[PDB]
Symmetry: C2
Subunit: 139 residues, 2 copies
């Protein structure tokens, strides 16, 4: 397994009955293959906190999962190229933060048993979701 990205990112954390709050959360993005299962390619992403070792949300998407995801979401690149697009968006979030009103923002909505991560672009009327991914607590 290869680590493509490993660092804190500014994330707007949303919880029911709480004000949105900006926190630096660490993202680790890995790619690898399950050779035992006919070389199944896998993308794994972890969201953690350097200052709270028990905070963890995980996503794992296989190339099989991606076949449907690609169609449903209108993704126009292959599975090998997909993580690079996520990383480019995270890089935009990092750069934008020092600004008065960041154009690109990372957003994590935490609920029971599941969280939803998005990277959004603020336009004239909404936060446009460039990517939306479901994470499971822990691991």
């Amino acid at each position: 397994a290869t680590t493509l990205f490993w660092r804190p990112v500014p994330v707007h954390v949303k919880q029911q009955d709480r004000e949105d709050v900006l926190e630096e959360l660490t993202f680790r993005i890995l790619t690898g293959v399950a050779k035992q299962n006919h070389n199944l390619r896998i993308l794994r992403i972890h969201i953690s906190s350097d200052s709270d070792l028990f905070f963890l949300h995980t996503l794992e998407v296989s190339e099989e999962d991606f076949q449907s995801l690609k169609n449903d979401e209108g993704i126009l690149v292959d599975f090998a190229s997909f993580p690079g697009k996520i990383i480019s968006l995270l890089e935009k979030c990092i750069l934008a933060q020092p600004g008065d009103s960041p154009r690109f923002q990372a957003v994590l909505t935490i609920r029971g048993g599941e969280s939803v991560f998005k990277i959004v672009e603020i336009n004239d009327w909404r936060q446009l979701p460039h990517i939306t991914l479901a994470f499971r607590p822990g691991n």
Copy 2:
């Protein structure tokens, strides 16, 4: 009730085990109020076909529904302004169609008991969803 929009729009229709196909589907967008229920404001949208009178998909969103929708989707305008933003996006779909590869496209995915309507913008790697709305068959 006031009609804000009523005309055909080019829609890319998607169905399981079928090629995507471009069809002109008629959209009617109405706004009104249920005065009996403490002046509840309502947005109604119908997707129909001039050439098939039995084809119909409907959405109805009240201002109460919008409170959650606005938060979950990061919409930054009020309920009164929301339909105008949808209409601006439909107008972009109409204008783009005569082009070799339309930048903005309307997409309707039809499934059992439900359809999902989106207006997307083609960028370097995906169809970016400017709006995503669930429709129910018939009415």
